[PDB]
């Protein structure tokens with residue numbers, strides 16, 4: 001129901017052609033839809049604290065997730081909520097109690113100001129690779145859609161060298 | 177219920193500092209919230225055709241809007257819809273019939289593939305300026321907040337020159 005973890009993320013923007021080629025190299029054919037419902041204050045408090053708050057709806061699950069700065073990478077706090085809980089946070093200015101609330105209070109985020117600001121859809125596939133999780137995302141934003149490759153690892157040094165070598169292996173330039 | 181118009185609108189991205197200064201400059205105090213709910217096919221058909229399809233929720237009003245290329249700026253087709261019509265489009269992905277649908281069919285969009293992809297909150301202020309309308313936008317996207325100045329004009333040539341001139345006076349670089 002609730003988990004925390006420290007995660008380090010690398011990300012690279014790729015063309016469709018690069019994306020398809022990399023998918024083919026890893027036998028990625030099926031993608032899973034997810035929708036991210038994001039929150040912020042009118043003053044952008046969370047962005048100011050290098051942090052992000054969202055409810056992810058993926059298959060049957062809603063997960064309230066906070067990402068904040070760690071000494072390196074991010075401290076993630078995840079809390080599975082009900083559909084009714086998720087709807088309530090989107091409709092009204094209440095955040096459910098529990099671990100995410102507790103972290104937001106330590107961050108000194110004016111919790112009552114948090115408002116549901118928007119949403120976006122991602123078609124996602126993951127594979128385990130080297131020190132971590134290689135993620136293939138195709139996301140649909142307001143104006144445009146992107147292809148992205150992410151790599152989530154627990155060891156920064158080796159994770160970074162591994163991601164960079166994978167990109168060079170496939171002739172994909174670094175685009176941050 | 178239904179209108180069309182050719183809209184000629186220049187846009188420039190600005191920083192938060194530039195934005196606040198420009199607002200003070202123009203005595204812009206009160207902003208109006210809107211939420212845009214955007215639609216696209218998995219193959220990005222709208223975007224490939226220079227177009228966009230969105231339901232705008234502002235105050236108590238919902239407007240289905242298609243923007244498409246014209247010889248100058250964009251041709252917009254707006255259709256006022258009820259809240260329930262709005263929600264059924266979002267939950268079922270079926271676009272209601274009428275002028276937007278008619279235009280979509282002429283563009284040759286595979287309309288049955290259109291899906292609800294996401295939403296975005298924009299805060300907007302306006303003021304009349306040199307025979308045009310100056311628009312101040314602050315939008316809250318998935319992990320950033322974006323500031324824009326826009327200028328809606330009647331004539332492309334002179335509107336351009338007056339927008340570029342405004343930007344120059346406030347030492348705002350051109351950023352499209």
Ligand SMILES: Nc1ncnc2c1ncn2[C@@H]1O[C@H](COP(=O)(O)O)[C@@H](O)[C@H]1O
Pocket residue numbers: 035057087090091267
């Ligand atoms: N602002 C909102 N208010 C109420 N319900 C919503 C809102 N956004 C999404 N939903 C609903 O909550 C569920 C999650 O939406 P989604 O993640 O967009 O599929 C769906 O059944 C939607 O119909």
Ligand SMILES: Nc1ncnc2c1ncn2[C@@H]1O[C@H](COP(=O)(O)O)[C@@H](O)[C@H]1O
Pocket residue numbers: 211233263266267295
């Ligand atoms: N994905 C969705 N599915 C069903 N209903 C929604 C969805 N998104 C928004 N709504 C509803 O439509 C109305 C407009 O939402 P908003 O424009 O997000 O304020 C609200 O009363 C919501 O409960």
